[PDB]
Structure 1
Amino acid sequence: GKDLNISLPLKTKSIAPYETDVPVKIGAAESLFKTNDQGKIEKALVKSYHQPNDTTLDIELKDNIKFQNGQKLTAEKVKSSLENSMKKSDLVKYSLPISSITAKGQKLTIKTNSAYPELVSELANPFMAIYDTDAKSDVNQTPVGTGPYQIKDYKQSRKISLSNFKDYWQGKPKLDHITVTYQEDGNNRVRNLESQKDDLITDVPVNKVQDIENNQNLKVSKESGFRTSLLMYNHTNKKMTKSVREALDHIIDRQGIADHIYQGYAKPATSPFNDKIPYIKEPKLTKQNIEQAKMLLAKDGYTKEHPLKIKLITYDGRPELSKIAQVLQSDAKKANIEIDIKSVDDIEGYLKDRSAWDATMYSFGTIPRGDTGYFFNQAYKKDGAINKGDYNNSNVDDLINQLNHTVDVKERHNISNDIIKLSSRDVPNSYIAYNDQIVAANSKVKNYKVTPEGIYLIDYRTTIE
């Protein structure tokens, strides 16, 4: 009727907002701040804020906002939500170095111990979305947010059912119900769309784009965005030496991957960050060189008779990753590396066992809110939430720590580029492509978001005509 069916990759376990960005994506939860369609930070739940000095953030919340259970969004509710998320999630904790929070009425004051200029930016992170900590339901199954669609039922790792919250603060939402089901295989997501089992899908495989564009019942939307595919190394395994990481870096053919695997919907990568960001100084592009890789591997004693063995993990959710793994395996054999590819259904859970993998295909949104700090703190610091391979170098740590208290924006750019230059020498990961996000829908579905941060999808204006 006005019911919308969505098919997404990357199944979740908990759907607490501090465990996954899914509740923000599907319209259930909202953070204090957001980014707009051009990627700039804006107030969302906040009416006004001020920073009287470099350790104090004063916020006044909007006065007309309710949670989906009818409770008012007050400063006390925001305090308890943020404190709970800090306690329950390392990602949230390491992004928000908050020393205290005080609340009265609609006003809250957030303090830090020292200057952290990216604090407001990180309050736009979907993992910091606000939920009602006093709700008498399990936040891991049916959290209660302020968004336009309330989660009514969750079948773990399979299906989320949401219903219109009529008193949504920005206006009455335009759909009656949304059903989200997980499907990891992109070809299956496309088949579900073509058969009308689903109405909106994300992460469309590039080789299906033409088939969908050809269909007059469907439409495809693409956004270049800020997501990077990569080969991530497990630094806790002593065999993954600098020579080995450099060898693998030279077996990748980034230009060929962008042209033939992504069919032009990606550009070859050097650093984590898309080269379209104008202040980023990218390292030199590595061109494939099998002879160089063989020479590097000989440094550690590997030969055709005694090759390096690598267990490489992959997953289906981002559909080009496993196509890249196959061609890495074929080419690596020419350089005396035998790669065994293991495709897994739950990538984040699988990689927690650091004895079970040598390298993994991976993807990540490296600059979702306009600053490089988030990525460096989460991917290049020990215990950072996306640093699955435990990369850490004290010299890089020092620069990241300096960046965190640096207010002057041009100085932040300079330190960021120094971190890129120093870290690149270690080959912490091999960044492969800056690739577009491709979303497809039935033509009757209108006003979903396909914007550069790669997080938002559903809002109170999304509809079916």
Structure 2
Amino acid sequence: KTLVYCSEGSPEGFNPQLFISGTTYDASSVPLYNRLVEFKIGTTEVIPGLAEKWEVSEDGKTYTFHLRKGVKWHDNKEFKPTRELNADDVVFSFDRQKNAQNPYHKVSGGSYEYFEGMGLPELISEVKKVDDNTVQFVLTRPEAPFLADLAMDFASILSKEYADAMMKAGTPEKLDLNPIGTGPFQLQQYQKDSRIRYKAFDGYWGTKPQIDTLVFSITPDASVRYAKLQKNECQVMPYPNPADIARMKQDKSINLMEMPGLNVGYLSYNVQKKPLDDVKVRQALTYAVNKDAIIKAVYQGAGVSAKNLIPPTMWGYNDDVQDYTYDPEKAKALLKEAGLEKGFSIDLWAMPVQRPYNPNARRMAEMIQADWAKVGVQAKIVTYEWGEYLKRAKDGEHQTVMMGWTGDNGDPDNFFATEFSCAASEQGSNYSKWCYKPFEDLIQPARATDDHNKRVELYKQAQVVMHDQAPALIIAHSTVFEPVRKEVKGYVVDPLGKHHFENVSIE
């Protein structure tokens, strides 16, 4: 009947539209609300949510959503709904973020950060009501990742009946502070320095949670989380201390669940800077490096070797690629064919901050400098303060630079196109400055088409092109660790990084 989760900090609010933090999302969008479309648990595949089906026009610019009938809203001290979900609720949700003429646009400050971050103000031409159970979106271009954007937490549907009411009582901020949703749990109590209490929503459209009472115990210190887990004061916890992983692995009261994180760490080769314009040279520098040694010494169990830009938790992953080996002799042969038998000198920018996809860039750089020296390549390690590092790398001032990415929507486009397209190169966030027609000929059709099978084919071939042309040395993906006590049944780790309790039971 009850499950206690040791959370890592307090939510900023209960309206996910206004925030970008996973800590906040775990306490709001995940338990209380639903989206039009949802991610299938354990994957980044999209399925029906508050919309039982969708249709896409021939030109890829008009989306039709046919809404689910009979969906109930929560209630509170002040609100009791008189109708179920409809198109008004859905249009209000997106119109509030896009339209400055909407009465709720400036409410609670109007910071619609992810909405804006995903480019929706510009992409969306119009959001319209067709009837009470049908909504359309017309876009300014074809955009296959738009469905994955609508499964994101900021796209949670709010109640228009309740918003009207709170604007009527002259207390519109209550829509944001006292949540009303369609989700599996309802909010019962909250106290910022202590805990959050939820209860299974009896009216839920989906299958009712098997957990009757869900409690969040706000615990910022990770050592105290594990201590609480050991006492059975909480049954689930996130982000263990790196130091505790070995013990947790031997702890017979828990399953230490693991998964690749939604990210990647790489070293870009600026193909505009000689001799890095020659594919043979890029290949040589890649063969020369002893990547197993780097994974071991730098990540120390919190990462895994990467051979593809996207992690294996995403769809479209090509498991047929065979990664570069560690082969100095082949690197020397390559260098000779390139007419650089004698090596050359080059710079190597090391990240000044620590990230899951690259936790020790200084050590890594020293390792790569040692590897390259053996094939005659004398590297100069450079670094700058984070803002400056970013600004100069964005203008292509580097010869080689360590960078990475964390996924936003779980869609392959959000890695290949944002980081390695011709447009990204113009923009500067393609740090390889690689604009290649065979690549463009795969990622542009892939982002315009609606045929998922065709999308899978295209992204798998794109992984071949990247591998053959070696625009970047791909290094790794992080490893995520989630301790769960054995009495908890049905918990699945989420590739997008949220922590979900609506499908679990407790023994």
* Both proteins in one fold, TM over 0.5: yes
1:329 maps to a residue whose letter is E
Among 115, 119, 125, the alignment partner of 1:99 is: 125
Among 255, 259, 267, the alignment partner of 1:219 is: 255
Determine if the alignment matches structure 1 residue 271 to structure 2 residue 311. Answer: no
Alignment partners' CA distance in 2, 1:62 and 1:351: 53
C-alpha distance 257-236 of structure 1, shift in aligned 2 (>3 A): closer
* CA shift for structure 1 position 90: 4.0
Determine if the alignment matches structure 1 residue 311 to structure 2 residue 350. Answer: yes
Query: Structure 1 regions of 5+ residues with no counterpart?
Result: 345-349
C-alpha distance 97-154 of structure 1, shift in aligned 2 (>3 A): farther
Partner of 2:198: 164
Determine if the alignment matches structure 1 residue 34 to structure 2 residue 38. Answer: yes
* CA shift for structure 1 position 397: 4.5
C-alpha distance 105-67 of structure 1, shift in aligned 2 (>3 A): farther
**Which protein has the bigger helix share?**
2
Partner of 1:347: none
Q: Pairwise CA RMSD of aligned residues? A: 5.2
Deviations 1:32-54 (A, max 9, x none): 22232463432222244455755
C-alpha distance 367-245 of structure 1, shift in aligned 2 (>3 A): farther
Deviations 1:430-465 (A, max 9, x none): 3223554321134455544314x3434223355666
Deviations 1:394-446 (A, max 9, x none): 73455422222234445434432443344456645432235543211344555
Partner of 2:6: 5
Partner of 1:63: 70
* CA shift for structure 1 position 199: 4.9
* CA shift for structure 1 position 229: 3.2
* CA shift for structure 1 position 111: 3.1
Alignment partners' CA distance in 1, 2:442 and 2:353: 32
2:213 maps to a residue whose letter is L
Partner of 1:200: 236
Partner of 1:255: 292
CA contact under 8 A between 1:236 and 1:354: conserved in structure 2? no
Partner of 1:459: 501
With normalisation by structure 1, the TM-score equals 0.70
Determine if the alignment matches structure 1 residue 420 to structure 2 residue 484. Answer: no
User: Percent identity at matched positions?
Assistant: 14
CA contact under 8 A between 1:4 and 1:199: conserved in structure 2? yes
CA contact under 8 A between 2:354 and 2:361: conserved in structure 1? no
Partner of 1:128: 155
CA contact under 8 A between 2:301 and 2:479: conserved in structure 1? no
Partner of 1:44: 49
1:41 maps to a residue whose letter is V
C-alpha distance 286-131 of structure 1, shift in aligned 2 (>3 A): farther
C-alpha distance 49-402 of structure 1, shift in aligned 2 (>3 A): closer
Alignment partners' CA distance in 1, 2:223 and 2:288: 28
C-alpha distance 400-84 of structure 1, shift in aligned 2 (>3 A): farther
2:88 maps to a residue whose letter is E
* CA shift for structure 1 position 274: 4.5
CA contact under 8 A between 1:132 and 1:145: conserved in structure 2? yes
* CA shift for structure 1 position 195: 7.7
CA contact under 8 A between 2:223 and 2:241: conserved in structure 1? yes
Larger radius of gyration: 2
Alignment partners' CA distance in 2, 1:252 and 1:150: 52
2:318 maps to a residue whose letter is I
* CA shift for structure 1 position 212: 0.7
Query: Structure 2 regions of 5+ residues with no counterpart?
Result: 100-111, 167-171
Alignment partners' CA distance in 2, 1:394 and 1:400: 11
C-alpha distance 431-394 of structure 1, shift in aligned 2 (>3 A): closer
With normalisation by structure 2, the TM-score equals 0.65
2:462 maps to a residue whose letter is I
C-alpha distance 286-179 of structure 1, shift in aligned 2 (>3 A): same
Alignment partners' CA distance in 1, 2:359 and 2:505: 34
* CA shift for structure 1 position 5: 1.6
Q: How many residues align?
A: 442
* CA shift for structure 1 position 322: 1.6
* CA shift for structure 1 position 22: 4.9
2:137 maps to a residue whose letter is I
Which secondary structure state, in structure 1, belongs to the residue aligned with residue 212 of structure 2?
coil
Alignment partners' CA distance in 1, 2:8 and 2:263: 22
Which secondary structure state, in structure 1, belongs to the residue aligned with residue 359 of structure 2?
helix
Among 118, 131, 136, the alignment partner of 1:109 is: 136
CA contact under 8 A between 2:352 and 2:385: conserved in structure 1? yes
2:500 maps to a residue whose letter is I
Alignment partners' CA distance in 2, 1:338 and 1:264: 28
* CA shift for structure 1 position 146: 4.0
